[PDB]
Amino acid sequence: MVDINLFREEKGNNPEIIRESQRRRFASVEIVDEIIKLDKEWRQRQFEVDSFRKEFNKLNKQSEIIQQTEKNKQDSTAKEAEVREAYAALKAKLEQVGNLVHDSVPVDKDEANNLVIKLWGEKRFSTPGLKLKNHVDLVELLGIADTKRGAEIAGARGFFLKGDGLMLNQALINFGLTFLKKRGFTGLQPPFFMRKDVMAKCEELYKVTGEGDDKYLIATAEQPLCAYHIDEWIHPTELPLRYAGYSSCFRKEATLGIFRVHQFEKIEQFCITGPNENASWEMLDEMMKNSEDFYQALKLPYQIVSIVSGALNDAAAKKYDLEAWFPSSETFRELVSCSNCTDYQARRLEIRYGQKQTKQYVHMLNSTLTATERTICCILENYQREDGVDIPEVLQPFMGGETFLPFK
Amino acid sequence: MVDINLFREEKGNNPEIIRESQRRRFASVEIVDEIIKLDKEWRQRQFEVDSFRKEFNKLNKQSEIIQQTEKNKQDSTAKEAEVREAYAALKAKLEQVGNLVHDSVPVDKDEANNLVIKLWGEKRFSTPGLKLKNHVDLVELLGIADTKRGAEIAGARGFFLKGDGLMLNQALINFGLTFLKKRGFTGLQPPFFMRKDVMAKCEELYKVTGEGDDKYLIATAEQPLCAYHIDEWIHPTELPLRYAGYSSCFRKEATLGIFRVHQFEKIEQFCITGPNENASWEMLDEMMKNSEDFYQALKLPYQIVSIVSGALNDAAAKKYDLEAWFPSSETFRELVSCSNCTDYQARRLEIRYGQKQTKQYVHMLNSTLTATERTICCILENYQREDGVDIPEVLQPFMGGETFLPFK
Numbered sequence: 001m002v003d004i005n006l007f008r009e010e011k012g013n014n015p016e017i018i019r020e021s022q023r024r025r026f027a028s029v030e031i032v033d034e035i036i037k038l039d040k041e042w043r044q045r046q047f048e049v050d051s052f053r054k055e056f057n058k059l060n061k062q063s064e065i066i067q068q069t070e071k072n073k074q075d076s077t078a079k080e081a082e083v084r085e086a087y088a089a090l091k092a093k094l095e096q097v098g099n100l101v102h103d104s105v106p107v108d109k110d111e112a113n114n115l116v117i118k119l120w121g122e123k124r125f126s127t128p129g130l131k132l133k134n135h136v137d138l139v140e141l142l143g144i145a146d147t148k149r150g151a152e153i154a155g156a157r158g159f160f161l162k163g164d165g166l167m168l169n170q171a172l173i174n175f176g177l178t179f180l181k182k183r184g185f186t187g188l189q190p191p192f193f194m195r196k197d198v199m200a201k202c203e204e205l206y207k208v209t210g211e212g213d214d215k216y217l218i219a220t221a222e223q224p225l226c227a228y229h230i231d232e233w234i235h236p237t238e239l240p241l242r243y244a245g246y247s248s249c250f251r252k253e254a255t256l257g258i259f260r261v262h263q264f265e266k267i268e269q270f271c272i273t274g275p276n277e278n279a280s281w282e283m284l285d286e287m288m289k290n291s292e293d294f295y296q297a298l299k300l301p302y303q304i305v306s307i308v309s310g311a312l313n314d315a316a317a318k319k320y321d322l323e324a325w326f327p328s329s330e331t332f333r334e335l336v337s338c339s340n341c342t343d344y345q346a347r348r349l350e351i352r353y354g355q356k357q358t359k360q361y362v363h364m365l366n367s368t369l370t371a372t373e374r375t376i377c378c379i380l381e382n383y384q385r386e387d388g389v390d391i392p393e394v395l396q397p398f399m400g401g402e403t404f405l406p407f408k
Numbered sequence: 409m410v411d412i413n414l415f416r417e418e419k420g421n422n423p424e425i426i427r428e429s430q431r432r433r434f435a436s437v438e439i440v441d442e443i444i445k446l447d448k449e450w451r452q453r454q455f456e457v458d459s460f461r462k463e464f465n466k467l468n469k470q471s472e473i474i475q476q477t478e479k480n481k482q483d484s485t486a487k488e489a490e491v492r493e494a495y496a497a498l499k500a501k502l503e504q505v506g507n508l509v510h511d512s513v514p515v516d517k518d519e520a521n522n523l524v525i526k527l528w529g530e531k532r533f534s535t536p537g538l539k540l541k542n543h544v545d546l547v548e549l550l551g552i553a554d555t556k557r558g559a560e561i562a563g564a565r566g567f568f569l570k571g572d573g574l575m576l577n578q579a580l581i582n583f584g585l586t587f588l589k590k591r592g593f594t595g596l597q598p599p600f601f602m603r604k605d606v607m608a609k610c611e612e613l614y615k616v617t618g619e620g621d622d623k624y625l626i627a628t629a630e631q632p633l634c635a636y637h638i639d640e641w642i643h644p645t646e647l648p649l650r651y652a653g654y655s656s657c658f659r660k661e662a663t664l665g666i667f668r669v670h671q672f673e674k675i676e677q678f679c680i681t682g683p684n685e686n687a688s689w690e691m692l693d694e695m696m697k698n699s700e701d702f703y704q705a706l707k708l709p710y711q712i713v714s715i716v717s718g719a720l721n722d723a724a725a726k727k728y729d730l731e732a733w734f735p736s737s738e739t740f741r742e743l744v745s746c747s748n749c750t751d752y753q754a755r756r757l758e759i760r761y762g763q764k765q766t767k768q769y770v771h772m773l774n775s776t777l778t779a780t781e782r783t784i785c786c787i788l789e790n791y792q793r794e795d796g797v798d799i800p801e802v803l804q805p806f807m808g809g810e811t812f813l814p815f816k
């Protein structure tokens with residue numbers, strides 16, 4: 001949720017900023033007045049208690065009187081119930097309000113109008129010499145995934161990684177983790193389980209039943225790496241925090257191919273900053289430079305698009321995608337999303353900024369470095385030859401010096 | 409299930425072998441006669457069809473006659489139903505019979521009497537200079553797993569791997585995969601999902617709900633690597649097959665420690681052989697030598713125990729455990745199980761041996777190489793110093809040359 005304080009004229013904050021952000025999200029502007037009207041009620045009860053607190057403690061410092069100090073306690077428990085109700089009803093509207101859309105975000109309702117802002121790399125095309133094959137056919141020819149036997153075993157989109165497929169998957173995971181460890185990141189592998197209560201604050205997911213409470217399978221490392229540091233204080237000397245999240249991922253939405261799948265592995269950049277001095281906006285550039293340097297090391301051409309205000313989800317204040325070149329189909333596909341969600345999750349998760357006045361909260365960002373099966377698919381297409389696939393230079397050490405994967 | 413043919417005096421096979429194996433499993437010997445009595449019924453119906461087949465086709469080669477060729481079809485569909493019932497009732501008893509216990513297996517009902525057969529390594533002990541800490545306390549001191557934050561997130565026994573904890577986990581996974589790839593193995597990473605129908609032939613597991621049929625989370629790579637090759641023919645030139653299974657594992661049975669946990673990673677040796685020439689018994693030694701060479705490369709002292717006939721599960725014909733030395737508690741704990749299950753799963757999974765007479769079936773074996781979190785725990789205890797933990801020599805390349813993990 002957003003800071004109630006940014007709706008209060010009282011504290012020297014203009015609620016038009018909220019109204020403008022609603023407009024840019026093509027969402028209710030009327031709700032900003034609804035919330036102001038509710039906040040005011042609630043703060044009156046919040047105060048309408050301390051009226052009967054003082055009048056209660058006023059009687060004290062002395063049945064035309066003894067019956068007066070009776071009702072003033074019946075009051076301060078009756079009115080405390082009203083305060084509870086007000087808080088609750090205020091939660092129901094404020095919950096619905098998206099994060100404040102940064103001004104640099106292109107305003108529009110269709111991702112069709114996503115603003116390309118950067119290009120990189122010399123894109124390969126089908127020549128007369130070699131028709132460029134797609135990832136689906138190159139996985140079959142290389143013999144590095146059993147999607148057929150996978151499908152009988154795990155149901156639809158189910159796949160084994162095999163031989164140099166597993167070595168490659170593992171090569172990319174360790175290349176990514178070392179890549180990021182060199183840039184000040186600490187590895188973190190979360191449990192693939194998470195309690196629904198906790199997921200709430202961070203049903204398009206798998207439910208796992210058995211030991212304890214019903215839990216979800218995680219769609220992204222980003223979800224466990226957000227619950228981590230719940231209810232904690234983080235000291236300014238700790239921030240900024242850089243975690244290289246690693247995990248398997250389970251998506252419900254998706255017998256040939258490993259691009260459009262139910263289970264996959266993923267390195268995530270997850271960063272916490274303090275909420276002042278433009279720190280989170282500086283970290284968003286930092287993480288986006290890291291995503292860039294990495295696809296450049298792999299020598300995969302790409303373009304960076306900024307996401308229209310209309311397409312930002314409720315947590316994101318701003319978002320880029322790195323779309324990389326798939327030469328057989330001459331398309332760019334999404335291999336990175338890079339979000340600054342500022343204090344939106346932090347404030348629900350009571351993740352605070354102080355030593356331990358009025359409450360400050362940390363800023364949190366997330367940026368896929370690589371979804372391995374997707375990155376592989378992109379590697380296959382861009383590195384293919386007449387009779388196999390060359391291995392990118394930087395992955396060659398992690399594959400024991402091998403430079404080539406021949407077709408069966 | 410076991411080969412019905414080994415219950416038939418008829419084919420030159422002595423059913424006493426079955427009876428003896430039942431004795432060694434301390435299980436029903438009476439059931440071997442029950443099954444013979446059922447098999448005989450079934451084969452009579454199986455034949456009692458071909459009596460009314462020939463008499464039906466006998467009438468043909470000519471209403472004192474035309475009504476005779478009527479009933480002989482009413483028969484051959486009526487008696488075919490009886491054959492179905494016999495087959496089904498025979499399945500219900502034969503299902504309950506364990507695999508034939510190899511003669512080299514120690515006969516006893518208590519694992520207490522497991523026969524140690526081999527020792528290796530110079531075991532470390534608490535000296536006056538250094539009280540040897542346990543894995544639980546060494547994980548806290550090293551700062552390589554958040555079991556506390558894990559527990560709030562994933563419920564009980566839930567843990568993050570962190571910093572050099574993740575690097576180590578990954579070091580062991582890649583050390584194991586290369587270790588095995590050098591010994592003729594092909595990497596395989598299965599889906600962590602598997603359809604209950606399929607699991608049946610390979611409810612102490614997690615159920616996953618969402619897309620498609622209800623599925624289980626796998627307890628071991630061994631389970632998906634068993635369904636793989638279902639209903640297939642394998643050619644003698646293909647066998648023997650060596651797969652290095654890699655996966656996450658989910659066990660229901662288990663906020664400090666990563667040894668006794670719900671989720672963990674595991675390299676498995678899974679091997680298929682032909683069923684003749686003592687091939688599977690030779691492969692069991694091969695896999696057990698591989699498990700040995702690996703804990704020797706890690707320089708972890710261990711002992712090999714042979715499992716008493718009384719403790720073999722229904723698939724295993726024979727089984728060893730490699731128990732490794734945990735010096736703080738001066739105990740050996742199970743880090744490897746090595747099983748030859750011969751044609752027991754193969755025969756349910758219709759995994760055949762021919763080119764493609766009377767049906768031959770492949771032999772299948774499984775042998776944990778490493779459960780990574782457990783192996784780590786064992787590494788921590790055996791490699792500890794006053795102020796940190798040394799990194800095993802062979803894992804040092806995979807950890808970028810680092811030789812030591814200091815306490816926080």
